[PDB]
């Protein structure tokens, strides 16, 4: 069946501390607070220019109060994990040592 979700319009919450993997990647667990779910999670790893990449192919939220694990590879050093669109978009500062 033709899998098509609109980009999430509402706000997202970080559920647990960002966890680092042994293969130089990070797992960001988030939940959706807005409407229109199931929807595609807007996700980008940028500077304060795209710097990092997404591992979880098509990150989607099924419903409200249902956390989703997003695996992503941030670049070495400084980066900003941007989850969702404005207003009140989630911007997480990350530093990979």
């Amino acid at each position, epitope marked *: 069946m033709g899998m098509s979700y609109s980009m999430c319009t509402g706000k997202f919450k970080i559920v647990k501390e960002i966890a680092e993997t042994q293969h130089g990647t990070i797992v960001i667990r988030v939940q959706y607070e807005g409407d229109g779910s199931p929807c595609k999670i807007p996700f980008e790893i940028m500077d304060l220019h795209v710097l990092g990449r997404l591992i979880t192919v098509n990150p989607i939220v099924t419903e409200k*109060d*249902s956390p989703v694990n997003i695996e992503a590879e941030p670049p070495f050093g400084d980066s900003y994990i941007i989850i969702g669109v404005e207003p009140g978009q989630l911007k997480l500062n990350w530093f990979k040592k």
Partner: single-chain antibody
Amino acid sequence: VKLLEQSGAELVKPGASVRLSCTASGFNIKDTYMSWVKQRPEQGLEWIGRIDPANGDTKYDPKFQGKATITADTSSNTAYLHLSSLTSGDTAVYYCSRGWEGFAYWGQGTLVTVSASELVMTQTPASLAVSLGQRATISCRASENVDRYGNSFMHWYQQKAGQPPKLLIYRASNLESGIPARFSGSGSRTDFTLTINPVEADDVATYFCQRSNEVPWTFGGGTKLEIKR
């Protein structure tokens, strides 16, 4: 249907121990952190500690060390609070609460009746008298930073009598879903404010600020919002 259901009221003799349960339905406990909160009659909220039910990692406020033990059973989707050698000081309503960016879901509370270099969260004013339709500002000053990933983990709650707290604001300025636009938050670093504009009759309650960036996830002393007489 998303809900946290706690075990019934407990009558404990002084010196005895007790274990309270918190059963989740509609969601999995392993999804986020589960905290336990103590509230003595007519007093403020006291964060005991938190559990990550996925790996069983526990963190406590120093005040509850040698008193509280938080556990979880993922198969039964239940979190637990063990309290040892009870005294009248342990007589309170104990709440279980889900989440990191503010506690959106709370249990109904469990009454426990006993019968025979630290982080400071300064909430001002302790009491606020306001007329119907007025602007009300509640301040919260933390002794340490409340930042994590460049975000201020400052949350605000509304608590009415005989009811668990209700999350209003999370991440210092974000309005919780379902909460009216009259509630707003602002601030950064250590200084934070909650604004209720205009104050309605339903707004008569006790308000609490809370940090969650790092353990302890300390609540402010509270602000009792009343109507001007």
